[PDB]
Amino acid sequence: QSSLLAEFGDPITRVENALQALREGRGVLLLDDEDRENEGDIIYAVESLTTAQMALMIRECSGIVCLCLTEAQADRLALPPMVVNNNSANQTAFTVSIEAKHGVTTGVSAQDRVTTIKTAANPQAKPEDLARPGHVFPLRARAGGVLARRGHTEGTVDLMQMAGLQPAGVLCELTNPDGSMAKTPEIIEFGKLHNMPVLTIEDMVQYRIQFDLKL
Amino acid sequence: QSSLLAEFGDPITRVENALQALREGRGVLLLDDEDRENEGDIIYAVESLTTAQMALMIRECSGIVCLCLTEAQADRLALPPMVVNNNSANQTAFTVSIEAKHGVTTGVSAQDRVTTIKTAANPQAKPEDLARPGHVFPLRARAGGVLARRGHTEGTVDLMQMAGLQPAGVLCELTNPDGSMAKTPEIIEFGKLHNMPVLTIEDMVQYRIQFDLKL
Numbered sequence: 495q496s497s498l499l500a501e502f503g504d505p506i507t508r509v510e511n512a513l514q515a516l517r518e519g520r521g522v523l524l525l526d527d528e529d530r531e532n533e534g535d536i537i538y539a540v541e542s543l544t545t546a547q548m549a550l551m552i553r554e555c556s557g558i559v560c561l562c563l564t565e566a567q568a569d570r571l572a573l574p575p576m577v578v579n580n581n582s583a584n585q586t587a588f589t590v591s592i593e594a595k596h597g598v599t600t601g602v603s604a605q606d607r608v609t610t611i612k613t614a615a616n617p618q619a620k621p622e623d624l625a626r627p628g629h630v631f632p633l634r635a636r637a638g639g640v641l642a643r644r645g646h647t648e649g650t651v652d653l654m655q656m657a658g659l660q661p662a663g664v665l666c667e668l669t670n671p672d673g674s675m676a677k678t679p680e681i682i683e684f685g686k687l688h689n690m691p692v693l694t695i696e697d698m699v700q701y702r703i704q705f706d707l708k709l
Numbered sequence: 710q711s712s713l714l715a716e717f718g719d720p721i722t723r724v725e726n727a728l729q730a731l732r733e734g735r736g737v738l739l740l741d742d743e744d745r746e747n748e749g750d751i752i753y754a755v756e757s758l759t760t761a762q763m764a765l766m767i768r769e770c771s772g773i774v775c776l777c778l779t780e781a782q783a784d785r786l787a788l789p790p791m792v793v794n795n796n797s798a799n800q801t802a803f804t805v806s807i808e809a810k811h812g813v814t815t816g817v818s819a820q821d822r823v824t825t826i827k828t829a830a831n832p833q834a835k836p837e838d839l840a841r842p843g844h845v846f847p848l849r850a851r852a853g854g855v856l857a858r859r860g861h862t863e864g865t866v867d868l869m870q871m872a873g874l875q876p877a878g879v880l881c882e883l884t885n886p887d888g889s890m891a892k893t894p895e896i897i898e899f900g901k902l903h904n905m906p907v908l909t910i911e912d913m914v915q916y917r918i919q920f921d922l923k924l
C-alpha cells in the first residue's frame with residue numbers, strides 16, 4: 495500500500511495536501527488501517543458542504559452518510575448513543591439518527607441531508623432543531639482524535655481541526671459499482687479522477703505525534 | 710399521475726403485475742400518496758434477494774436500505790424502536806440498526822447487507838444473530854398493513870404477503886443522479902429501463918378492500 499500511495503507523496507505531504515484541499519472546500523479520501531476496515535471514506539468539511547458534494551457521496555458511496563461531531567457538539571444536540579451496549583465490531587459511536595426539524599421534506603435528498611447536517615453542526619444549535627429519527631447519522635469522535643482512537647470518525651474531526659475549520663465533517667465509504675467496497679487501488683484511481691488527495695490514519699497519527707499536535 | 714401510470718395498467722392490473730414480478734424474484738417500484746412523501750421506492754423480496762439487486766439499490770437509491778419486518782419478526786429479534794418518542798414527520802418505525810454478527814466484515818458491502826438482511830429475516834432467527842448498531846435499518850410494519858398505515862413499510866410487507874412470499878422485503882428511495890429524489894416521471898422511466906412494475910399505495914388499498922383481503 496506504501497508504494498501505491500507514494501505517488502501522493504510522503505506521509506507528511508499526504509497530510510498537508512489533504513488539509514489544504516479541505517481549506518479550499520474540496521474533499522479528501524481517508525483510509526484506515528489495512529488490519530481494520532481497510533476502507534476509504536470520502537470526507538468533506540461541513541463548513542463548505544454543498545448539495546453537489548452530497549450528491550457525489552450518495553452516488554459513489556454507501557449512501558449511509560455520517561456527520562462526525564465533537565463530543566461537545568453531540569452533547570449540545572442531546573444525542574445519546576443509538577444503543578447503550580454497542581456490540582458492533584469497532585464500537586462505531588452512532589447516535590440516534592437525525593433530521594432537520596425545519597427546511598426539509600422527506601430528508602433524503604442531497605439538499606435535505608445538507609440542510610440537516612448544517613443545522614446539526616451549527617455551534618448555536620439546540621436539540622429541538624433536530625427531529626429523531628432521520629436520514630443523517632451522527633458519530634461521536636473520541637477526545638484525543640486519532641491519537642486515542644484510529645477510526646475515520648476521529649480522522650474526520652481531526653482533519654477539520656488541523657485545517658483550522660469548524661470541527662465537523664461528513665464521511666461515507668467509497669463503493670464500487672458492483673457493490674463491493676473500494677480497496678486502495680480503486681480509491682487512488684477515484685482520487686485522481688476527482689482531484690481528491692488520499693491519506694491514511696497512520697499518516698495522521700505520525701503527523702500529529704511528530705508535530706506535538708494536541709487539538 | 711393517474712394518466713402517467715395508465716401505461717402500466719389499471720390499478721388492479723398494476724397490483725397483479727407487481728405481485729407476479731415479486732414471485733419471479735424481480736423488483737417493483739412503489740409510490741406513496743402524492744400528498745405524503747411522493748417518492749418511489751425500489752422494493753425487493755428478501756427471499757430472493759441477491760447481491761446484484763442490493764448493488765442496484767445502493768447505486769441508484771439513497772443507499773439507506775431498509776428491511777421491512779412484521780411486528781412479530783421485529784420482536785423475535787428484540788429490536789426496540791430506535792427512539793421512544795419518535796418525532797419524525799411520518800413516525801417511520803426505525804428500530805436500532807443491525808449487522809449480522811457472523812459472515813460479514815464491515816457490513817456495508819452489497820453482499821454484507823444481504824447477509825445481514827437474510828440473517829434478520831430468517832424465521833428461526835434469534836437476537837444474538839445481530840449486532841447493533843449496523844448498516845441495515847429495520848422498520849416495523851403496522852398490523853393491518855396499508856389498510857392501517859399508508860407507508861411504504863406496510864406496502865412492502867403487504868406485497869410479500871399478497872404474493873405468497875415470506876413477509877419481509879427491502880426498500881430504498883429512488884434518487885436522481887443530481888441528488889434530488891425521483892418523481893413519478895423518472896420512476897416510470899426507471900421502471901421501464903429495469904423492467905420493474907410500478908404501483909401506488911392507493912392501488913394496494915383499493916385492491917385489498919375490493920378483494921376483502923385481510924393478511
Ligand SMILES: O=C[C@H](O)[C@H](O)[C@H](O)COP(=O)(O)O
Pocket residue numbers: 526531535558560584585586633644645646647648665667
Ligand atoms: O457508517 C459508518 C461506518 O461505520 C464507517 O465505518 C465510518 O467510517 C465510521 O467508522 P469508524 O470511525 O469506526 O472508522
Ligand SMILES: O=C[C@H](O)[C@H](O)[C@H](O)COP(=O)(O)O
Pocket residue numbers: 741746750773775799800801848859860861862863880882
Ligand atoms: O428510510 C426510510 C424512509 O423513511 C422512507 O420514507 C421509507 O420508505 C419508509 O417510510 P414509510 O413507511 O413511512 O413510507
Ligand SMILES: [Mn+2]
Pocket residue numbers: 526531533535645646647
Ligand atoms: Mn470507517
Ligand SMILES: [Mn+2]
Pocket residue numbers: 741746748750860861862
Ligand atoms: Mn417512504
